[PDB]
């Protein structure tokens, strides 16, 4: 069966761990050690094919990150809709990925997490404009309610598969 190396990247506190654990274990973990960087495996059927997902939940403890950028086939670039800095940070993650991969066409999905929260500081339109300039999909998610979580990951698998 086909294996996919997915990397979850983004500023600390955006919900990278909560998104990964919600996909893998089907539950919301509100307290997960922000220093642990761990991998999770999951066998899933995507468009009638059995896939093996190897997902790296990055922790940010920059050249040491190159190793998972080299192994990684697709990147889930996560920001929180109530963290302007995490949205502005995306430009930096995108550039490092492009440089390490030596390519302008790397499978990526921009994810705006914590969509259950009120008073958002990053508008959907701003992230759509950012995603359009990169030529990648934008999806909003909530690791808390599980909204868009399967979609964000399976869309990234499709971006890799269709590359
Ligand atoms: N309301 C809400 N809180 C979330 C969501 N995802 C994560 N959180 C919270 O955001 C904080 C950081 O989450 P975490 O997964 O550790 O982020 P990471 O540093 O990017 O791994 C914790 O307090 C989580 O409970 C979400 O979709 N909605
Ligand atoms: C092989 N798997 C059991 C673990 C695993 N899953 C991944 C999914 C996407 C990208 C990389 C990986 C890795 C590791 N391979 C690396 O290069 C690397 C760098 C830092 C890490 O923390 C982990 C890894
Ligand atoms: Na984390």
UniProtKB/Swiss-Prot annotation:
Report the subcellular localization.
Cell membrane; Golgi apparatus; Golgi apparatus membrane
The UniProt annotation puts motif Effector region at 32-40
Effect in UniProt of substituting residue 80 to T: GTP-binding activity reduced by factor of 30
N-acetylmethionine, modified sites: 1
Q: Which residues carry this modification: S-nitrosocysteine?
A: 115
> Mind naming one GO cellular-component term on file for this protein?
endoplasmic reticulum membrane
Tell me the impact of changing residue 38 to N.
No effect on interaction with PLCE1
Q: Give the residues the record marks as binding GTP.
A: 13-18, 29-35, 59-60, 113-116, 142-144
Result of mutating residue 86 to C? Found in a patient with severe fetal hydrops and pleural effusion; uncertain significance; decreased activation of Ras protein signal transduction
Q: Which residues are glycosylated?
A: 35
The record names the disease as: Costello syndrome: A rare condition characterized by prenatally increased growth, postnatal growth deficiency, intellectual disability, distinctive facial appearance, cardiovascular abnormalities (typically pulmonic stenosis, hypertrophic cardiomyopathy and/or atrial tachycardia), tumor predisposition, skin and musculoskeletal abnormalities. Congenital myopathy with excess of muscle spindles: Variant of Costello syndrome.
User: What is the protein's known function?
Assistant: Involved in the activation of Ras protein signal transduction. Ras proteins bind GDP/GTP and possess intrinsic GTPase activity.
Q: What name does the UniProt record give this protein?
A: GTPase HRas
Question: What is the source species?
Answer: Homo sapiens
Protein's gene: HRAS
